[PDB]
Symmetry: C2
Subunit: 209 residues, 2 copies
């Protein structure tokens, strides 16, 4: 039956995952071993099996973003030296931890907005990614916010950002490129729908006629 193990586990190692058993203990003594990537081919020895007990262990932390599944085969051999069964497939699923912060595709996004743009007009878009597991978890679920605006004139909150899409809009009036030529917004992306790990970048908006 399929086995799962979280990434990034603390020691001590090794750690038991499951005990393999041949119904062919009828033959007395069986010796167990495993093959596959993560066993006897690279990366070698991430999993091992106790020869006599059949205990299948993990020997170090896993990393879902590097390898997310392993396919091993367990072998069972008599003391006279013959395989007593065909190799049995084992499937190991690495489950995700929130160990990647969202990462903005650029450090500085640049856009422009026209004087007299209607309140509610889209201006530009910022984008972050998150390497964590977006299928099974919220570890990659990104909310966008604005942290600050420089300058704070003529109003402190000239703009808003859609917390899902990262589209920035102008939401009030009084753009004037001859007094305040640009706006520099610090934007944040945070996973767990905004409550999780975060980073920031900058969006710089040029005011046009």
């Amino acid at each position: 039956p399929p086995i799962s193990c979280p990434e990034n586990e603390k020691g001590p190692f090794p750690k038991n995952l499951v005990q393999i058993k041949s119904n062919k203990d009828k033959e007395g003594k069986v010796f167990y071993s495993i093959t596959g990537q993560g066993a006897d081919t690279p990366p070698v020895g991430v999993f091992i099996i106790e020869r006599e007990t059949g205990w299948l262990k993990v020997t170090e932390p896993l990393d879902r973003e590097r390898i997310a599944t392993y396919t091993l085969f367990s072998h069972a051999v008599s003391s006279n030296g013959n395989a007593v069964e065909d190799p049995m497939e084992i499937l190991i699923t690495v489950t995700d931890q929130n160990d990647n912060k969202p990462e903005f595709t650029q450090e500085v996004f640049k856009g422009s907005v026209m004087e007299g743009a209607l309140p509610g007009t889209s201006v530009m878009e910022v984008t972050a990614t998150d390497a964590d597991d977006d299928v099974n978890t919220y570890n990659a679920a990104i909310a966008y916010t604005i942290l600050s605006q420089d300058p704070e004139l003529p109003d402190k909150n000239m703009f808003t950002i859609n917390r899902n899409t990262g589209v920035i809009s102008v939401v009030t009036t009084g753009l004037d490129r001859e007094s305040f030529p640009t706006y520099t917004l610090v934007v944040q992306a945070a996973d767990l729908q905004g409550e999780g790990l975060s980073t920031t970048a900058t969006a710089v908006i040029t005011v046009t006629d």
Copy 2:
């Protein structure tokens, strides 16, 4: 055979966990049910089992910090209405996500320190806890930092904090009650050994004669 499920999974629900079998299905219909806290006692219906297929399922997201291990029992009953097995114990392990910030044990810690205190002199100790899995993960592994000091004289950094223990110490010279009787530090606790979710509190230090 031992089963696990991450907390806080996305749907859709329900999700298959494992299929229970009796080798008594040779004879005819077996009907499957489960008892225990999480099944028929509180919280009720978190796990169900398909009567015919014996597919054990989970019906909603789990919260490890509510219940981290469930002990259920599977029952198997002939279509004529007799138990064809002893009830069989099922252990479900709920594996952790980092969804709890550290939390200081109080919002304001107090300490005092002689103005004639040598650099390296312990002043006080702040303390946080984290409800996540401190045994298997780093999701509750807290690192303490200082974020701010007030006032910022005679130096901005009159104190340092032990990353691991939260012990605060005098780091430099010039403690003087009459000029500055009171320092107010903002301290922070963050999990994943400092890289993770974070909270802040305050330490208020009095300079004594």
